[PDB]
């Protein structure tokens, strides 16, 4: 048997790597039409439907018309041809009949749409078929190894993909060639193993027979409106009138198994919510391990890193250990446990989020308006605010922003010891942090900050304030602040972590002065304001003040929730697909796998429909999103599964004819 399984494993590995490393370049290239076209949105939304519908259109072809082997071969051939046509056409579109080549490229995309889906159920069913005579242990081993191989391909695509771009903007030839070459290699290596495989062909158009039988049965059931109309069994009482009992039993088994999958799409949609939330939580969790400098958005790879190790470990040790203590640990129990663990992952996440909430600042809401005062003069200033008065020495700042309401922010007065009083005439906008600058009794400035949230991706924001008489221009690590007027401040520009250097340029500064300066270690999530001041010899000098404190909590704290989520995903998915194959009848192994994939498709549709989030508070959002939905789904699924859906040994039940 191993000779018949190694080829399948390598083919799956290569195909998955190709698809994952191909999708990103696909979207990058199709962005040409997305922008060139809101007409493009309609096309995309109907196109994704083809990708979500191809699985059934492949399974139906495989089981009834051509068989699994022929379907795999043909679908792989067309998929490779699609990649090849996309690769060749993309060259003309970027070098140069342009609409013709664009149409050929779109036809290639459509062809790939078929291939991406046509292989998923058929290959799994073909792999499962190879085991016989009570080798269920080896079958489970194979299924676990197959699931591991899929994630290994995904991880390799994730790690390799970044190297590709702009390695040669016209690097598309390699981009669309390498996946095609790898898919061709996979197809050839799979085909060369034909001699050892085991294959079957259908007796006929089973799907058409099933459709006709179902129609006749439901019509007959709707007959006899006043003669034993209540069913003894929904189809045994009526379909039996004309059709063979074997087909009746097969459809009965398929319907019975499929009944269990009704709740699963909701679970999938709920589970998918973590992707766009935990990354942001990482953004606000930019604390760093002392050893290395992982970026906030790189945490997502931990899922694959954990799965590719968890999958072997369970089958290797855990299940034998659970069996030794005699727990009789069956499939339905495994799936329920997996979903429960998935639920617990989110409660751990909620605990971490509420722990984080301690050290974040508070930003204005609604009509609230916030102000920070910064004295940049040579002397002390006294400033009167609504219901408060503050004294600031030279080159000094208020520790934190003062919060007021737009209606109540009516009077502001500035004065210095023995100096005249100046009233503020500027206007403050609601929901915006404002910086107030004072350097003299009758000289001040109001600056809109713009920053009302933690910087995206944990980057550090920097801005400069000019105190020189003439304009100044600042360049720092590939970015430039140009033409800053006297006693004015520029907008924030975001930079990644690490130390950075910058140069100061201005006509007022004599050329012989020191041009360059360096900043301290910026860490993550922080924002700082720099003030440039004139020395005795006209040289510039730099001083720093803080605006938002650097982030505190270490980023390693996300590991527990990710570990729980990965365990729940594995122990659920592997057992789910194994059970799906196990209970399917002989004539329809592929259809039920296609139904399993449709289960994920429907969850994807549900998550897309719900779309943007609107929960009032993150702590409650992370909390309910399991405590009120996931456990309810789990209890519903357990109640449904309580009715002996596992009673059927599909392999031998049909022997009674």
Author numbering: 12 to 48, 50 to 108, 117 to 188, 195 to 683
Q: What text comes from the article?
A:
PepT1 belongs to the solute carrier family 15 (SLC15), also known as the proton-coupled oligopeptide transporter (POT) family, which consists of four members in eukaryotes: PepT1 (SLC15A1), PepT2 (SLC15A2), PhT1 (SLC15A4), and PhT2 (SLC15A3). PepT1 and PepT2 are best characterized and mediate the uptake, distribution, and resorption of di- and tripeptides in the body. PepT1 and PepT2 are secondary active transporters, which are energized by the inward-directed electrochemical proton gradient. On a structural level, human PepT1 (HsPepT1) is 708 and human PepT2 (HsPepT2) is 729 amino acids long. Both polypeptides consist of a core transporter unit of predicted 12 transmembrane helices (TMs) of the major facilitator superfamily (MFS) fold and an extracellular immunoglobulin-like domain (ECD) placed between TM9 and TM10.
